[PDB]
Amino acid sequence: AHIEPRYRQFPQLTRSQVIQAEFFSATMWFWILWRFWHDSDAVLGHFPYPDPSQWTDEELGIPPDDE
Amino acid sequence: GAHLARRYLGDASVEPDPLRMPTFPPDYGFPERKEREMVATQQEMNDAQLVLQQRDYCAHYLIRFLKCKRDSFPNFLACKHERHDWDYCEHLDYVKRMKEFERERRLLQRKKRREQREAD
Amino acid sequence: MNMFSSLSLVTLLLLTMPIMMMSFNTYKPSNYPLYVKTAISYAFITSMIPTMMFIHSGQELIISNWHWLTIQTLKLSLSFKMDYFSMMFIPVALFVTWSIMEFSMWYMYSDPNINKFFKYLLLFLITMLILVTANNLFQLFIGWEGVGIMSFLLIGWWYGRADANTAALQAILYNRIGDIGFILAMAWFLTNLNTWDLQQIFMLNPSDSNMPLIGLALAATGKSAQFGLHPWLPSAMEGPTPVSALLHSSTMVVAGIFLLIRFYPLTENNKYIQSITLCLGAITTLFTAMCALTQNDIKKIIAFSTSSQLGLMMVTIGINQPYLAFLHICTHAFFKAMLFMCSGSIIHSLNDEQDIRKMGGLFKAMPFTTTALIVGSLALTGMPFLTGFYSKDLIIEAANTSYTNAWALLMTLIATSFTAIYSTRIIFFALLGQPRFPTLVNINENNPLLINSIKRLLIGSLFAGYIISNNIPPTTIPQMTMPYYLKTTALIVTILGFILALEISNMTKNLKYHYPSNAFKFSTLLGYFPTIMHRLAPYMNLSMSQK
Amino acid sequence: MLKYIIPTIMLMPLTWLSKNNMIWVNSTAHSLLISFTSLLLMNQFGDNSLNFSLLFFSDSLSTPLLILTMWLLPLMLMASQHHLSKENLTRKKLFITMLISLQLFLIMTFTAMELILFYILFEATLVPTLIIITRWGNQTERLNAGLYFLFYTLAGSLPLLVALIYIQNTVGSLNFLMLQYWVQPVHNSWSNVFMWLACMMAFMVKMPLYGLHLWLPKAHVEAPIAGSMVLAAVLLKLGGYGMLRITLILNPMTDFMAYPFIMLSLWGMIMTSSICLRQTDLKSLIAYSSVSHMALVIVAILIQTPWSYMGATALMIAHGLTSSMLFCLANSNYERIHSRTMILARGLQTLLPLMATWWLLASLTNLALPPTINLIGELFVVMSTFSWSNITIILMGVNMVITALYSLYMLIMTQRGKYTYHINNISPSFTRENALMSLHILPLLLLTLNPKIILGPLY
Amino acid sequence: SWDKDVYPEPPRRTPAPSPQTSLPNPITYLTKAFDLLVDRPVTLVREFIERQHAKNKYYYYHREFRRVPDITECQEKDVLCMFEAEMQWRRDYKVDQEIVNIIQERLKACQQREGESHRQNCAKELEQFTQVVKAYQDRYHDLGAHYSARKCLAKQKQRMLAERKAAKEA
Amino acid sequence: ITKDMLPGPYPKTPEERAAAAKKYNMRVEDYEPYPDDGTGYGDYPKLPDRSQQERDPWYDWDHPDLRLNWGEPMHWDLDMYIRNRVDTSPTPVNWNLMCKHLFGFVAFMLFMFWVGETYPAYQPVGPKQYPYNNLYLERGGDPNKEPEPVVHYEI
Amino acid sequence: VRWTYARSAFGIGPLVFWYYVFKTDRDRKEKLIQEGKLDRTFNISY
Amino acid sequence: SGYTPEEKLRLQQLRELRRRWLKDQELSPREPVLPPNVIYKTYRHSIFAFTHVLIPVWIIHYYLKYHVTTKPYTIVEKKPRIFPGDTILETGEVIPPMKEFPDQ
Ligand SMILES: CCCCCCCCCCCCO[C@@H]1O[C@H](CO)[C@@H](O[C@H]2O[C@H](CO)[C@@H](O)[C@H](O)[C@H]2O)[C@H](O)[C@H]1O
Ligand SMILES: CCCCCCCCCCCCO[C@@H]1O[C@H](CO)[C@@H](O[C@H]2O[C@H](CO)[C@@H](O)[C@H](O)[C@H]2O)[C@H](O)[C@H]1O
Ligand SMILES: CCCCCCCCCCCCO[C@@H]1O[C@H](CO)[C@@H](O[C@H]2O[C@H](CO)[C@@H](O)[C@H](O)[C@H]2O)[C@H](O)[C@H]1O
Ligand SMILES: *C(=O)CCCCCCCCCCCCC
């Protein structure tokens, strides 16, 4: 047993587990920031969404009210 | 959307019915429309084995993207431009559908306005 | 095709070699579990070569190699369908199983029947690969019932415990109810068509497909534990933790969803079956998420997390997005298998304690388990660009913009918010706070088998979604134009779930005396479905038998 | 068929002329050789049957039943010798002689051309059967309880004899090959209704049909292990084999005369499976399990479609090997605890690890796990009865659920849980017992590789 | 190997490789590794076996069944003529089961081969399968487990009577 | 076992009721037969209808998994009350209230799903347009015929 | 022993019910087949 | 509310025997009496690849190439996708391009 149990105390830790836990915690955040920088559209929106109240009658081909 | 509250809570008479529209002649109100032009031939999509739902008015941009996807492997990051052209061409198609819905709604209001202009 | 097909079968044949060698061929019971892990690891490599060829040029095959039986005008052969779904699912399942087997090499170390445990996991994997690659319904049935029996033998692993034998028999009962739907489809396809082959079924493409598709929906309802046939999946926690990791990711529970994906050429043109599976999935995704809010057993929470995610998969089937349903099966297998391996790491350290009320203060005590649990939790809750986001995010966008049942859509969005609540519940009570576990501390996650097995899945839970979604070919037209408030709906309700869960968790610390609620008891006791159904239904049947 | 009749008879001189301590060795060895030569019957043809002579023939229906019959004699000898070891030598040879004579009547019964020759042998099999069950049975209770002998002979054997005698007068022959070409349709008529029942009631009781089945559980609780093996494996199939043959000359009256018997079978299929959940006696549980399985065979024979006849043949063989193995598994426990109660000895997997594997395999075949021929037969009958009426899928499906429930309940109660504390005489499984189980299951599983040789003539 | 007319397949059209990436294609390299480690050693073993086979050349034959009179020409209750006609009908029935199997195998091979275009490109296979299944159903469906030439003929004459009657109605 | 230690006919007289009570290792005041009818219970005791899950798990039972002592009379439906089957333990919520909340939840969700079909959600867009006469030929349409054309216009 | 001795020592109604369920179904199905109104285009297994 | 004097004495006497019994379950040093670095990991892996990959694929390739593929429709490929501008290997054919796209 390279780790002795303790009584009512915080367990003994190794450096290897702490470093690896930090490397993969920091990898997760690097990946999220790296992708958000390059693919922010995937979260906010790829293309503009038109407002149909703006389209004119000419382009929608709506005849005048007296025709 | 707000359009659903209008049709279910407000007046449904002046709201396009999604399952039956368009309910007006396509020419009506248009001095000579142009037909939609399809670039990819019908045998080309058959050879490319596109999914039928994908054989729409954008299939030429998908045929291009699928060709580049094959020809750039292993590089699975090699076709962002071909992919975006297909995506954009689909966005423009979706907007065209959004115009048809608005055109159908505006006309349904013109009919209503004219029906109640008469009885008045 | 000579290399594609040869390497497609060696992967299946290779997995059976440790089974054949059990007949004392150079047998080395010293390290049979290591031998099984190695075979899976090599099976993963060989399976990745056909996958690359499919990724490259979309190459696909059917291999009907052995003619088994002819019944007049119904020829039955051993036929493997090595297509899109088989290409991509097999490497994922083998990758996940490889980590679970290395984890089991440590978790099950002291079990005297260690060798028998690994043989059962290998058979449990083989019957799943028979299922996915099956090209006719009969061969699909062999795998379909195959996983069911291995579920029974692994759930009831500790066979001196009456609760384990009761949960093993419960899985069989609920699954054989679903198999009534499976045989109904087989009977209908044989009669109205003249085949059990998927090729002739899709070629004929019946329109009057209500009956065979209700049969498949029922079969998927039991196998993937949708509402109505759902209580067995939480009960299946009686099995050893490595069993739950496999059961809830790369094998049994996704078979029900996989079956409906196989038959998407039929469900495409049946708005009636689409409406049934949408509503069926929508209640499941919510109900099971609501149950998970008040559970205290760590394995029970994750088990309800699975039912809630399987419900979302069933919703995706019902909005006519079968390829997003498959993409979720693949991604979900990564972070869900990891969460079970993180729970087992905690359970093992605390001497077989599974109640989160007796955990706490583990954030620093178990640093690598903490890192994987946080990554797993964020991937489950659709944190942008982790493995879970590439499927969940598109599914919510596709559900929002479809011609859909309005109530099913609202129930699907609330279930997404609840996902953030019970995920927080695990992190808050297991990792934060002060320790609430006994005084003799045996916390030790320093084992290479534990570290390596979790590490590989952690890497998958980060990049697997991105790598897969960038390699699979387009089979649909993804709908990318849509209002901002529909685009960001999944992220927003996820964030409000996290905010809404911190307040609930923090109020547990106030020195105020709780008061039980009707809603709380409803969620704690699983809506009373087990208490009523599992007492009343056995009573009526068993009392009916004697008289 | 004389190459099987004559060697079978020669087992009697062999048994009576062996050294005193070689009776089991000698008869088992030579009866296994007869079983080996029975595989030459699989010289079947697509169009014609194997018609040896004026008396005997074989086709794809009788051939698998003959092979099963000849396989079972050595297995019965292996299963019987432990509990007959304290029996004196002259009574061991009489017991063996009863088994040999039972095989002699069975192989002749399955191959007879003439239906009257079939009738005499079909009844002669009861003489060795009742002697074995009563003379070597457990208790003083009468298997032929008097009521059952009367009901069967009055409502079964006698009406069948008169119907067969009547048919030969009208047709001029009862040779089955002739009946295939000279068969005439049966018109609606009160007299014809009674000919139909007369031709069928005897086989319905032997199957047994639900409502006429109470005799079977009683017989199993009394019989010695060999009796239960032959009774479950073969003797029930005599009724099934008879119906598959005699229905040739009963059309089209079977179109409507079969409804009550289909209803009894479809409902009784579920009622007997449920009874298996509340049985306290292993031999009774397996007996009620046989009633449930034979309900499918009756339905399959009565709807008479190509798929149901293929399913019926597969079911009869699969049940024969599975129910026989279940009785042997139960008997091995009984030879230690001397009780048929299923709750008495529990957690046996702890004490007998390999025997628990035989139990599991026996239970998986019983609940019809794919691709075992147990399922192949059951699936074919399910497929055919769905066409007969789609609603039947509900009853067929529910029975599949219940069958899985009592199969695993039997496995769980006896093999799992905590062992019983005071039972301290569970000795390790003998080589004889392990070999007896493996000779049941290995052929049963090997047939999955080549199912066509058990699918009958309709294949 | 088989007969190309019975089990037809259209000519294969595989596009030439047209790479557009400087990265090596790992599939092409694995293909050479396969063609060297697997195919050639396998081919050598087979060629040796086929050498032994060429030394010993013996032939087997496909049995031919001369035609005999059908059940329609048999006298009533004349078993000698009914027997041969009955056996011939069973042989034809078994052959017809395999003709339907061939047509189904074409239909299934077509669907997989055509991929996403199968609905249009397998219409000829679907039509042929439809007509053969119709013809088989006309002959042999609903005869029962105790089918025979006699019952097949009774079904046909009943169908012929209905066809003849509907002609008058016309 | 003798015939006097076995189940017998229904007890008529208090003397017999005592004899059966002793036969079953029960005291006379505890013993009661089932109602005398055609059910055929005989003189077998009618014991409380409770599952074995209600019995003291800590007591040193002779049969620990069945929680039964040796010589103790076995409830008639015992095999239905073993720890693997029917359980009758007291529930934290009254049985009747549990049924109303479960059924009320299923009833309210089924109703709401019906309303969701009646008033579906959808986006404000016209139908998706396809070329070549709505893909008449691709969808397997008959090529000997000519479809009545479908024309799509630019907007 | 006493327990298993006692243990080892609705009716037609469901049969009548199921008779009418199946008899009615098969009469409706039989009528449709004679009127050609039942789809059996690909049904050749039975 | 505690142990009676006899209860303590019986417990003590069973403690002596129970603890002696458990001590007797320990194994003697001789028991059981049985009857009569990169390269290593590479050799174990190299021998595993040979026995569990190379031999199986030799048998599978032989089986497919000479026994399965020689029967019709046993291995059915999906036909390769042909895109405009391709060159067919079998015939040398040249698939034409698509029309000129409108500007976008
Ligand atoms: C379909 C036909 C297939 C034909 C297959 C022909 C058989 C070829 C296999 C021969 C060698 C098998 O060898 C079998 O597997 C591995 C090989 O390392 C051995 O296992 C060995 O390696 C593993 C790890 O690699 C160790 O955990 C184990 O301690 C060690 O003994 C088994 O103990 C041996 O029984
Ligand atoms: C598992 C073990 C089972 C053992 C029992 C089965 C094995 C028996 C194998 C014997 C097979 C012999 O098969 C036999 O081969 C010889 C090869 O010359 C053929 O011989 C014949 O063929 C051709 C011309 O006809 C000539 O080459 C030869 O002169 C001629 O005699 C026979 O026509 C064939 O029937
Ligand atoms: C995602 C949204 C989910 C929302 C689901 C909402 C529907 C589920 C409703 C379950 C509760 C129904 O509640 C129904 O009325 C009350 C309690 O409410 C119960 O009856 C009784 O309950 C409690 C306790 O006795 C009393 O306070 C109440 O006054 C009384 O009526 C009924 O037995 C039940 O039928
Ligand atoms: C407008 O954009 C429609 C699509 C967005 C989600 C609609 C939300 C539906 C609200 C719940 C109504 C439930 C009725 C049963």
DSSP secondary structure string for all residues of F68-107: B-TTPPPPTTHHHHSTTS---PPPSS-HHHHHHHHHHHHH
B100: CA distance to ligand 2 center in Å?
Answer: 80
E77 touches chain D (CB under 8 A): yes
Question: Using alpha carbons only, what angle is made at residue C240 by residues C243 and D363, rounded to the nearest 5 degrees?
Answer: 75
Size of interface C-H (CB pairs under 8 A): 61
Let me know: does C126 contact C15? Beta carbons within 8 Å: yes
Strand H75-77, strand A6-7: pairing: unpaired
Q: Indicate the Cα dihedral angle F82, F84, F87, F91, nearest 10°.
A: 140
Residues 6+ away with beta carbon under 8 Å from B81: none
Helices marked H in chain H — which ranges? 5-23, 38-49, 55-63
Beta carbon of F113 within 6 Å of any ligand 3 atom: no
Question: Using alpha carbons only, what angle is made at residue F10 by residues F7 and F12, rounded to the nearest 5 degrees?
Answer: 130
Q: How far apart are CA A41 and CA C482, in angstroms?
A: 13
Strand D57-58, strand H75-77: pairing: unpaired
C465: CA distance to ligand 4 center in Å?
Answer: 29
Cis ω for the linkage preceding H32 (within 30 of 0): yes
Distance of CA D121 to the CA centre of its chain: 16
Beta carbon of F101 within 6 Å of any ligand 3 atom: yes
Q: What residue type is assigned to position D326 of the chain?
A: L
With CA atoms as reference, the chain C residue closest to H46 would be C42
Tokens linked to D195: 């000919």
- Within a 10 A sphere around the Cβ of D142, how many other Cβ atoms? 16
First-last CA distance in chain D: 23
Interface of E with G in 83-102 (CB under 8 A): 100
With CA atoms as reference, the chain D residue closest to F61 would be D421
Q: How far apart are CA C244 and CA C338, in angstroms?
A: 11
Q: How far apart are CA C435 and CA A6, in angstroms?
A: 14
Q: Which of H5, H24, H26, H28 is nearest to H16 (CA)?
A: H24
Furthest CA-CA distance within chain A: 94
Interface of E with H in 21-60 (CB under 8 A): 37-39, 41-42, 45-46
Q: How far apart are CA F105 and CA F91, in angstroms?
A: 20
Query: Distance of CA D455 to CAs C226, C301, D313, D317, Å?
Result: 38, 49, 6, 9
Q: How far apart are CA C418 and CA C497, in angstroms?
A: 6
Specify the residue for token string 């799992």. D416
Q: Which of D347, D356, D349, D359 is nearest to D421 (CA)?
A: D347
Tokens linked to E138: 């006309």
Tokens linked to C453: 């097995």
Total number of residues shown for chain G: 46
DSSP secondary structure string for all residues of E22-38: SS--HHHHHHHHHIIII
E50: CA distance to ligand 2 center in Å?
Answer: 16
In DSSP terms, A7 is beta-bridged to: C440
In DSSP terms, H88 is beta-bridged to: E15
Total number of residues shown for chain H: 104
Strand D57-58, strand A6-7: pairing: unpaired
Query: Distance of CA D321 to CAs D231, D294, D358, Å?
Result: 12, 14, 13
E47: CA distance to ligand 1 center in Å?
Answer: 30
Q: How far apart are CA D228 and CA D220, in angstroms?
A: 6
Phi–psi pair at C355, nearest 5 degrees: -100, 115
Residues from chain B that touch A57, judged by Cβ atoms under 8 A, are: 106
Query: Distance of CA C327 to CAs A31, C53, C92, C322, Å?
Result: 21, 19, 11, 9
- Within a 10 A sphere around the Cβ of C191, how many other Cβ atoms? 20
Q: Which of D403, D211, D370 is nearest to D293 (CA)?
A: D403
Q: For atom 25 of ligand 3, which residue has the closest CA?
A: F97
Q: How far apart are CA D199 and CA D160, in angstroms?
A: 5
Q: How far apart are CA H65 and CA B9, in angstroms?
A: 68
- Within a 10 A sphere around the Cβ of F2, how many other Cβ atoms? 5
Tokens linked to E38: 């697997």
Query: Distance of CA E51 to CAs D435, E60, H42, H66, H73, Å?
Result: 45, 20, 38, 15, 28
Q: How far apart are CA D445 and CA C365, in angstroms?
A: 53
Let me know: does E140 contact E147? Beta carbons within 8 Å: yes
First-last CA distance in chain F: 98
Q: For atom 9 of ligand 4, which residue has the closest CA?
A: C406
- Within a 10 A sphere around the Cβ of D237, how many other Cβ atoms? 27
Kindly identify the ligand whose nearest atom is closest to the C-alpha of C19.
Answer: 1
8 Å CB contact of F65 and D280: no
Residues from chain E that touch H89, judged by Cβ atoms under 8 A, are: 13-16
Cis ω for the linkage preceding C240 (within 30 of 0): no
8 Å CB contact of E133 and G40: no
Residues 6+ away with beta carbon under 8 Å from C16: C126
Q: Which of C339, C334, C338 is nearest to C392 (CA)?
A: C334
Q: Would the CA dihedral through D178, D182, D183, D186 be positive or negative?
A: negative
CA distance F88 to chain D (A): 18
Q: How far apart are CA C458 and CA C376, in angstroms?
A: 8
Q: Which of C94, C69, C65 is nearest to C81 (CA)?
A: C65
Q: Indicate the Cα dihedral angle E114, E116, E118, E120, nearest 10°.
A: -120
Beta carbon of H53 within 6 Å of any ligand 1 atom: no
CA distance C161 to chain A (A): 30
In DSSP terms, D175 is beta-bridged to: D114
Tokens linked to D64: 């698998």
Let me know: does E21 contact B71? Beta carbons within 8 Å: yes
Q: How far apart are CA C285 and CA C315, in angstroms?
A: 8
Query: Distance of CA E81 to CAs D54, D271, D408, E73, E139, Å?
Result: 19, 50, 56, 9, 21
Tokens linked to F38: 């055609």
Distance of CA D243 to the CA centre of its chain: 14
8 Å CB contact of B102 and A60: yes
Q: What residue type is assigned to position C399 of the chain?
A: A
Q: How far apart are CA F16 and CA F23, in angstroms?
A: 10
Q: Which of C137, C135, E45 is nearest to H73 (CA)?
A: C135
Q: How far apart are CA D198 and CA C265, in angstroms?
A: 53
Which one-letter DSSP state was computed for residue D9? H
C290, C407, C515, C518, best to mutate for ligand 3 pocket (most atoms within 8 Å of CB):
C518
Q: For atom 34 of ligand 3, which residue has the closest CA?
A: F100
8 Å CB contact of A60 and F124: no
Rg (CA), chain A: 30
Let me know: does C362 contact C369? Beta carbons within 8 Å: yes
Q: Which of B65, B79, E27, B69 is nearest to C52 (CA)?
A: E27
Let me know: does D235 contact D215? Beta carbons within 8 Å: no
Angle subtended by helix axes C367-380 and C448-469, to nearest 10: 20
Q: How far apart are CA C261 and CA C267, in angstroms?
A: 9
8 Å CB contact of F66 and D343: yes
Strand order of the β-sheet with C74-82 is: C74-82, C61-71, H75-77
Q: How far apart are CA D191 and CA D163, in angstroms?
A: 11
Q: How far apart are CA C288 and CA C307, in angstroms?
A: 6
Tokens linked to C447: 């084992």
Give the binding-site residues of ligand 2, using a 6 Å CB cut-off. Answer: E 56-58
Q: For atom 8 of ligand 1, which residue has the closest CA?
A: H51
Q: Would the CA dihedral through F78, F83, F87, F89 be positive or negative?
A: positive
Question: Using alpha carbons only, what angle is made at residue D152 by residues D149 and D156, rounded to the nearest 5 degrees?
Answer: 150
Which one-letter DSSP state was computed for residue A29? H
Q: Which of C420, C423, C442 is nearest to C431 (CA)?
A: C423
Q: How far apart are CA D184 and CA D113, in angstroms?
A: 19
Residues from chain B that touch E115, judged by Cβ atoms under 8 A, are: 49
8 Å CB contact of C199 and E39: no
Question: Using alpha carbons only, what angle is made at residue F120 by residues F117 and F122, rounded to the nearest 5 degrees?
Answer: 155
Residues from chain E that touch B49, judged by Cβ atoms under 8 A, are: 114-117
Strand C74-82, strand C61-71: pairing: antiparallel
Total number of residues shown for chain C: 547
H99 touches chain B (CB under 8 A): yes
Phi–psi pair at C359, nearest 5 degrees: -115, -135
Beta carbon of F9 within 6 Å of any ligand 3 atom: no
E120 touches chain B (CB under 8 A): yes
Let me know: does D281 contact G1? Beta carbons within 8 Å: no
Residues 6+ away with beta carbon under 8 Å from B32: none
Query: Distance of CA C201 to CAs C59, C209, E84, Å?
Result: 22, 11, 39
Tokens linked to H15: 């403690």
Q: What residue type is assigned to position E127 of the chain?
A: E
What element of type H or E holds C133?
Answer: helix C114-133
DSSP secondary structure string for all residues of C2-47: HHHHHHHHHHHHHHHHHHHGGGTSS--GGGHHHHHHHHHHHHHHHH
Which of H48, H60, H78 lies closest to C6 in CB terms?
A: H60
Let me know: does H73 contact E108? Beta carbons within 8 Å: yes
Q: How far apart are CA H104 and CA B85, in angstroms?
A: 8
First-last CA distance in chain C: 63
Let me know: does E19 contact E25? Beta carbons within 8 Å: yes
Let me know: does E7 contact H72? Beta carbons within 8 Å: yes
The helix, strand and coil proportions of chain E, stated in percent and rounded to the nearest 5, come to 70, 0, 30
C288: CA distance to ligand 3 center in Å?
Answer: 19
Q: Would the CA dihedral through D198, D204, D209, D214 be positive or negative?
A: positive
D418 touches chain F (CB under 8 A): yes
**What are the b/e assignments for D383-399, b being 16+ CB within 10 Å?**
bbbbbbbbbbbebbbbb
Residues from chain C that touch A25, judged by Cβ atoms under 8 A, are: 371, 374-375
Tokens linked to C42: 């090599």
Specify the residue for token string 């049994």. C252
Let me know: does C82 contact C63? Beta carbons within 8 Å: yes
Decide: helix, strand or coil at residue H76.
Answer: strand
Residues 6+ away with beta carbon under 8 Å from C297: C237, C354, C355, C356
Query: Distance of CA D440 to CAs C436, D30, D365, D387, E40, Å?
Result: 56, 19, 11, 34, 45
C190 touches chain G (CB under 8 A): yes
Phi–psi pair at F88, nearest 5 degrees: -120, 20
Angle subtended by helix axes C137-155 and C252-262, to nearest 10: 160
In DSSP terms, D112 is beta-bridged to: D56
Which one-letter DSSP state was computed for residue D58? E
H78 touches chain C (CB under 8 A): yes
Q: How far apart are CA A28 and CA A43, in angstroms?
A: 17
Q: Indicate the Cα dihedral angle C228, C229, C234, C236, nearest 10°.
A: 170
Specify the residue for token string 């368009």. B22
Q: Which of B81, B88, B52 is nearest to B64 (CA)?
A: B81
Strand C74-82, strand D57-58: pairing: unpaired
Question: Using alpha carbons only, what angle is made at residue F39 by residues F37 and F45, rounded to the nearest 5 degrees?
Answer: 90
Q: What residue type is assigned to position D350 of the chain?
A: T
Tokens linked to F119: 């008033």
Question: Using alpha carbons only, what angle is made at residue D434 by residues D429 and D438, rounded to the nearest 5 degrees?
Answer: 160
Question: Using alpha carbons only, what angle is made at residue D17 by residues D15 and D19, rounded to the nearest 5 degrees?
Answer: 90
The helix, strand and coil proportions of chain C, stated in percent and rounded to the nearest 5, come to 70, 5, 25
In DSSP terms, F93 is beta-bridged to: none
